CSV table of N, CA, C and O in Angstrom, one decimal:
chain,number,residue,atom,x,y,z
C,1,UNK,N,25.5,11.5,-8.7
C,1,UNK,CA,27.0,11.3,-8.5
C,1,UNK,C,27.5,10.2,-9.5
C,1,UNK,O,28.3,10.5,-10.4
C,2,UNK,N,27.0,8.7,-9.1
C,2,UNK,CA,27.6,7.9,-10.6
C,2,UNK,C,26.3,7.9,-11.5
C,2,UNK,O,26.0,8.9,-12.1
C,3,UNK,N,25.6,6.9,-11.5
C,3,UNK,CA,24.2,6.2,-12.5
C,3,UNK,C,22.8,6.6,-12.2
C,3,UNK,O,21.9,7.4,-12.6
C,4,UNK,N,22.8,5.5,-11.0
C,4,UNK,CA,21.3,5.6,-10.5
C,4,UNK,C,21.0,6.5,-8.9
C,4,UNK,O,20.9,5.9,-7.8
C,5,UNK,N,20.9,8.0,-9.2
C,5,UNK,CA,21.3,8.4,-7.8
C,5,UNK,C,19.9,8.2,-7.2
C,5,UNK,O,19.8,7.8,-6.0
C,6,UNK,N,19.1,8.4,-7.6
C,6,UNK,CA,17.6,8.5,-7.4
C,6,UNK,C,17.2,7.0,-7.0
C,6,UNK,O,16.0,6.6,-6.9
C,7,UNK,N,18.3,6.3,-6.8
C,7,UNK,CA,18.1,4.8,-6.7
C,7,UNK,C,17.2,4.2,-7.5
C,7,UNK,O,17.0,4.9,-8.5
C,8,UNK,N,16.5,3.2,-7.5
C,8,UNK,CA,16.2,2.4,-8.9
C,8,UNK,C,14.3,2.6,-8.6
C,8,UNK,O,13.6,1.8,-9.1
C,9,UNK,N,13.8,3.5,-7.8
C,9,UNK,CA,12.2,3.8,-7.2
C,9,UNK,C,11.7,2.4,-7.1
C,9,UNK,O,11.5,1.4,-7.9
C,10,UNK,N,11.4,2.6,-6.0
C,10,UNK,CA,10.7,1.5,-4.8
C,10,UNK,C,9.5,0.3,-5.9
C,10,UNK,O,8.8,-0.6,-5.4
C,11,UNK,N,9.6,0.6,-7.3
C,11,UNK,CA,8.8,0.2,-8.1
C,11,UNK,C,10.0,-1.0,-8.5
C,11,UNK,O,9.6,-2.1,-9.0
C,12,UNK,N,11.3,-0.7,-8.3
C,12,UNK,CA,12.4,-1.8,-8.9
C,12,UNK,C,11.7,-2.9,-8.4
C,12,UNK,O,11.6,-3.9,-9.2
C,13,UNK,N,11.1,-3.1,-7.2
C,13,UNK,CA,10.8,-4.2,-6.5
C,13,UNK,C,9.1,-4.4,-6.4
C,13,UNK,O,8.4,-4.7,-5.5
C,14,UNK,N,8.6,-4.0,-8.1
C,14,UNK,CA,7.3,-4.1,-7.9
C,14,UNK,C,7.3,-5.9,-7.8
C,14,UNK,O,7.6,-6.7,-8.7
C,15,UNK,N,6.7,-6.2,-6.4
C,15,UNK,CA,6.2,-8.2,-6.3
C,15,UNK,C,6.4,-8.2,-4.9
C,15,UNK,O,5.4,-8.3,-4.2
C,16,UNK,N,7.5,-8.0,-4.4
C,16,UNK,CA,7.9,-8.0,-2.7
C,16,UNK,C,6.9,-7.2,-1.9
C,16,UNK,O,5.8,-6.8,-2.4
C,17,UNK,N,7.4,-7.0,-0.7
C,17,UNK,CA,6.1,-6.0,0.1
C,17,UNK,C,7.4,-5.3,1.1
C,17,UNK,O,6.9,-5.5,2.1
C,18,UNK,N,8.3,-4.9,1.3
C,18,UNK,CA,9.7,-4.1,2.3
C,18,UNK,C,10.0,-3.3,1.5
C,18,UNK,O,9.5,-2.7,0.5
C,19,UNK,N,11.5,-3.3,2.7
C,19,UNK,CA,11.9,-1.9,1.9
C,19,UNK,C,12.6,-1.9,0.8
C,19,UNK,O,13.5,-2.8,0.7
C,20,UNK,N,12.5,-1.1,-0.1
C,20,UNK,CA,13.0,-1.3,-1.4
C,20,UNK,C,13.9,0.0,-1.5
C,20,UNK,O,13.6,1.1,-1.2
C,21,UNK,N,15.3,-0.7,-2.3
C,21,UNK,CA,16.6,0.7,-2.1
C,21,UNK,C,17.6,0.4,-3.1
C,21,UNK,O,17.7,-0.8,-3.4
C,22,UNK,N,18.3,1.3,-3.6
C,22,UNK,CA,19.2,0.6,-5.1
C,22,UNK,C,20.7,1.1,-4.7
C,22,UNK,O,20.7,2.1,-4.0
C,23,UNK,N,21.8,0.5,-5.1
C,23,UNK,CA,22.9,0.9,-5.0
C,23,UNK,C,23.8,0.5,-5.7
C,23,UNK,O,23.6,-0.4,-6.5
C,24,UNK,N,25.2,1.1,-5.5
C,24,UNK,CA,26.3,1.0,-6.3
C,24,UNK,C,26.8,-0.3,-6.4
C,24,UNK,O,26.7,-0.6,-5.2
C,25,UNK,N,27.5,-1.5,-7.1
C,25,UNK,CA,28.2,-2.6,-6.4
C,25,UNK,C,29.0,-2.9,-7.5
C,25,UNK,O,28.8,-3.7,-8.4
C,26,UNK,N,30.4,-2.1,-7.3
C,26,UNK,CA,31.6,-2.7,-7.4
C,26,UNK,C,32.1,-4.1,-8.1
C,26,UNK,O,31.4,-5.0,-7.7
C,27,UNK,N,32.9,-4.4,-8.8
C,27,UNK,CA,33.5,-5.9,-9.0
C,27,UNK,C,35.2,-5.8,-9.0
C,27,UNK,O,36.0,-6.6,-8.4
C,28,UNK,N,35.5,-4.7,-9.8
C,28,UNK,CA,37.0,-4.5,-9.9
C,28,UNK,C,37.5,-4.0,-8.9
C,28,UNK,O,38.2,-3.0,-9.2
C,29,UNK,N,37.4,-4.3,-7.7
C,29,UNK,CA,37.5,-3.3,-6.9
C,29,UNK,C,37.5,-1.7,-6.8
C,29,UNK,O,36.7,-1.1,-6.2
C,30,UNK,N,38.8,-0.9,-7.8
C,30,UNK,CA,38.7,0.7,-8.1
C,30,UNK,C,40.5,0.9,-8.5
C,30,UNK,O,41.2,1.2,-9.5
C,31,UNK,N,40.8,0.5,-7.3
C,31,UNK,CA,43.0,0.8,-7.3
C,31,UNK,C,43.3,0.5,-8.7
C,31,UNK,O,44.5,0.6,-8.9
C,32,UNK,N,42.6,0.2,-9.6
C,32,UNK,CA,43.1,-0.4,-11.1
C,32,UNK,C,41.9,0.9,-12.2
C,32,UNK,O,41.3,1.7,-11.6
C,33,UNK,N,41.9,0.8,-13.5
C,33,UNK,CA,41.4,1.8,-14.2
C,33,UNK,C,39.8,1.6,-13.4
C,33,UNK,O,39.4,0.7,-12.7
C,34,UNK,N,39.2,2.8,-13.9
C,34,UNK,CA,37.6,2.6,-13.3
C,34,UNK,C,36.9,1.9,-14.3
C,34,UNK,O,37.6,2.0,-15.3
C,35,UNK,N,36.1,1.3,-14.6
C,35,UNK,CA,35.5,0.9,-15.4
C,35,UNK,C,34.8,-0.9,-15.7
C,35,UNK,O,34.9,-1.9,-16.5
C,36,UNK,N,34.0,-0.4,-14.2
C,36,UNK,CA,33.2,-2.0,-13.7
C,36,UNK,C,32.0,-1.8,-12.5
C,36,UNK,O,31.6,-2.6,-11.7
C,37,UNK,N,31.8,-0.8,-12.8
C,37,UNK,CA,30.9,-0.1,-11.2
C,37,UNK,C,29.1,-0.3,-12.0
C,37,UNK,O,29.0,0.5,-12.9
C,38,UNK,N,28.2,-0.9,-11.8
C,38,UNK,CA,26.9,-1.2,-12.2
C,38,UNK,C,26.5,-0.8,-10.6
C,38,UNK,O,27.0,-0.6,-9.5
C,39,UNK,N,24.9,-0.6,-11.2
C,39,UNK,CA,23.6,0.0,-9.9
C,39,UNK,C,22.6,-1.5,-9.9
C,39,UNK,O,22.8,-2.2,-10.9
C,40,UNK,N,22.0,-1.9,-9.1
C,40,UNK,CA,21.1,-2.4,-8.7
C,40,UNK,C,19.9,-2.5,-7.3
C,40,UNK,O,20.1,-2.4,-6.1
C,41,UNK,N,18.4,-2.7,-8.2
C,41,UNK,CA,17.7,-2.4,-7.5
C,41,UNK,C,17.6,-3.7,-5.6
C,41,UNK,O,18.1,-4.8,-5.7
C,42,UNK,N,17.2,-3.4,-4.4
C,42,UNK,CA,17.1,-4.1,-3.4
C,42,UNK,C,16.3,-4.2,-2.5
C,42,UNK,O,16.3,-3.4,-1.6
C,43,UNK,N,15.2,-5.3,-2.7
C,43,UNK,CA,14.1,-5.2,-1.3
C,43,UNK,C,14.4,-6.0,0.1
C,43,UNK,O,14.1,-7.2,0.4
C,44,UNK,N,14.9,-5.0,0.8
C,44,UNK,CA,14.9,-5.9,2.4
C,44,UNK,C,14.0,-5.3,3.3
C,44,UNK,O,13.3,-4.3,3.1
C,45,UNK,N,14.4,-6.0,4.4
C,45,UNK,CA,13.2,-5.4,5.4
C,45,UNK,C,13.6,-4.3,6.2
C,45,UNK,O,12.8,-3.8,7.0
Protein backbone atom coordinates (compact mmCIF):
# COMPACT_ATOMS: atom_id res chain seq x y z
CA UNK A 1 0.00 0.00 0.00
CA UNK A 2 2.79 2.79 0.82
CA UNK A 3 6.82 1.44 1.14
CA UNK A 4 7.48 -1.10 3.51
CA UNK A 5 4.25 -3.39 3.50
CA UNK A 6 6.00 -6.46 4.41
CA UNK A 7 7.22 -4.47 7.29
CA UNK A 8 10.93 -4.15 7.73
CA UNK A 9 11.37 -8.53 8.63
CA UNK A 10 11.87 -9.32 12.27
CA UNK A 11 15.73 -9.23 11.06
CA UNK A 12 15.32 -5.08 11.27
CA UNK A 13 15.87 -5.83 14.92
CA UNK A 14 18.69 -8.36 14.46
CA UNK A 15 20.43 -7.63 18.53
CA UNK A 16 17.09 -7.40 20.74
CA UNK A 17 15.23 -10.64 21.56
CA UNK A 18 10.85 -9.37 21.25
CA UNK A 19 8.72 -8.56 19.08
CA UNK A 20 9.82 -7.04 16.12
CA UNK A 21 7.27 -4.89 13.59
CA UNK A 22 7.75 -1.87 11.16
CA UNK A 23 5.52 0.97 10.33
CA UNK A 24 4.36 4.07 8.79
CA UNK A 25 5.27 7.48 10.79
CA UNK A 26 4.08 10.50 9.61
CA UNK A 27 5.74 14.15 10.35
CA UNK A 28 3.60 16.52 8.17
CA UNK A 29 0.81 15.46 9.38
CA UNK A 30 -1.27 14.76 5.53
CA UNK A 31 -4.23 17.92 5.33
CA UNK A 32 -1.22 19.79 3.48
CA UNK A 33 0.53 18.15 0.02
CA UNK A 34 1.77 14.45 0.77
CA UNK A 35 5.11 14.18 0.76
CA UNK A 36 6.81 13.26 4.39
CA UNK A 37 5.53 9.79 5.27
CA UNK A 38 8.98 7.35 6.00
CA UNK A 39 8.76 3.40 7.39
CA UNK A 40 10.61 2.19 10.27
CA UNK A 41 11.78 -0.87 11.78
CA UNK A 42 10.32 -1.65 15.96
CA UNK A 43 11.27 -4.11 18.67
CA UNK A 44 8.79 -4.26 21.61
CA UNK A 45 7.52 -6.73 23.77
Amino acid sequence: IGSTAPTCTYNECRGCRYKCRAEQVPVEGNDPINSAYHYRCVCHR
